[PDB]
Design a protein around this ligand. Structure first.
Ligand SMILES: [Mg+2]
Ligand SMILES: [Mg+2]
Lengths: 310, 310
């Protein structure tokens, strides 16, 4: 999606920011980096009904409490959103830093500290949004993919069915819950040098188990590109998180099961995208088997010490 | 193509610029918008042997003479280029402004003034680069596309052959020549408001007829999206150009033929790209017939007055 010069200039009169000097499309949503006579900005077109108030309101709340995350800029007319070339649109503050292509264990510690800080900061935010991608959503995604799963790997259907049944039967209820990011991968965390400078992209955020968000980050940050679990990174992540918000015995004990769950979650969306991408295109599509391999690894874990924490 | 944080930081120690605070992939070549503690910058990875010295050297020369175009930043080691993740790489100054999605005739006048200023400023630059996409290149492109041209439109082969033969037989020799941009479309010109703020992307630049560069801009700026020639824009463009560098009688007289030539040039690259893009992909490909239609229109022109200049 593109925007014209006059439309964007009109859009910016709804906000109190510099005058436009530059705008560039940058690498769901369309995003533009704006330069102005004041500060740079991010423009987001939502390529898209109470979810945006949740996401943008959460971002405000967290920023108001000191978290380094992007702040939605306020509109003159008091509305939450504008509109640009058909789509809902928001101006958002610009955070410095870059996401790490080759994170090291010391960075994972910063990530754990920041995730805990985010969990603590999210207290008092009262708009609710259930996780659309927990157990019930896994069942929907699987149901839609089940008959063609064996195209990805022979035996895949019979491997997954018992596991989804099991996770659903045992999914924990009585663990600390709050607002979680639910998608905190490498590309959603900024650093300036080795200091973490921000958390971005809260569009999967929702109310769910805090230790489930930890399990997403274990899956996201603590495995090597060849699939090897990296205990040095797992230790860093978990100790970093504990340094800010200690995990209970019940939370630590649940991590292997929760990590199977989050691994399955990414397996399932990747599987659905893989089966559903048109026959013969040149998007190279994410391999769902990466997350099946992570899921199997988590089944081997008898104690959180094995993730690196003890 | 992507770059890692450490590679880019090392790359920037070869230059005298701020420290890196941010980098973003932006919408041949891969381009990144860098923020630093000093000025913003553009990083270009050439997705690629004397052409870069020509292009980057031209950019330097023009900037040194006042033209608003991007300046290649100088390397500590005196070399012209660096290397990043396999590719040749250059840091380039950042120009403010945005390219016009909906240019009006008054903007076309600014474009004409700037093209003339560029032609005048390019005097004294002595590296030579022949146009690879003049008559000889048209013959190569056509030869490679000729047998499948009728797939785009019935009769296309027999329409083009006489025209390419004719242009080749009559292509003008004795018109003013110098360095031309050779690709000055809407997306290669920046404005801040209604003031033109820069010319960018000189990677088709070459030594050729100055009025041939004017004919590219007539083709690029002076037709509506429905194909209609816009005499108001043509007048603006040509009068703007004349206000800085008057065109001779011989140049004005040649414009219809030159415009057939430049129209054919874009027809041919578009045709080759169209035939050569894999069967069943979802890049929507540029229609070569747009430029066949422009070519036919130029055949109807008996006098430059009809483009709008008189
Ligand atoms: Mg380091
Ligand atoms: Mg205006």
């Amino acid at each position: 999606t593109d925007i014209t010069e006059d439309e964007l200039r009109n859009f910016l009169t709804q906000y109190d920011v510099g005058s436009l000097t530059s705008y560039k499309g940058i690498a769901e949503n369309s995003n533009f980096l704006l330069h102005t006579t004041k500060d740079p900005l991010i423009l987001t077109l939502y390529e898209k009904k109470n979810d945006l108030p949740f996401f943008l309101g959460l971002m405000q709340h967290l920023a108001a409490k000191g978290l380094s995350c992007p702040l939605p800029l306020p509109r003159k007319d008091g509305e939450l959103l504008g509109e640009l070339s058909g789509r809902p649109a928001a101006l958002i503050s610009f955070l410095e830093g870059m996401w790490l292509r080759k994170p090291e264990a010391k960075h994972c510690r910063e990530v754990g500290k920041a995730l805990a800080a985010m969990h603590l900061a999210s207290e008092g935010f009262e708009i609710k949004r259930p996780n659309a991608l927990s157990v019930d959503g896994w069942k929907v995604l699987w149901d839609k993919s089940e008959e063609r799963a064996d195209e990805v790997e022979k035996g895949l259907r019979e491997e997954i069915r018992p596991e989804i049944d099991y996770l659903a039967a045992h999914w924990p209820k009585d663990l600390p819950a709050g607002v979680i990011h639910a998608d905190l991968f490498q590309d959603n965390v900024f650093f300036l040098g080795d200091e973490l400078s921000g958390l971005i992209d809260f569009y999967f955020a929702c109310n769910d188990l805090l230790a489930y968000d930890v399990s997403i980050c274990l899956n996201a940050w603590c495995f090597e590109k060849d699939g090897a679990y990296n205990v040095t990174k797992g230790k860093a992540l978990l100790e970093g998180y504990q340094s800010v918000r200690p995990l209970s015995e019940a939370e630590l004990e649940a991590l292997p099961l929760l990590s199977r769950g989050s691994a399955l979650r990414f397996f399932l969306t990747r599987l659905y995208d893989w089966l559903t991408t048109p026959a013969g295109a040149l998007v190279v599509k994410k391999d769902p088997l990466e997350y099946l391999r992570k899921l199997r690894f988590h089944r081997t874990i008898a104690n959180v010490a094995e993730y690196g924490l003890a």
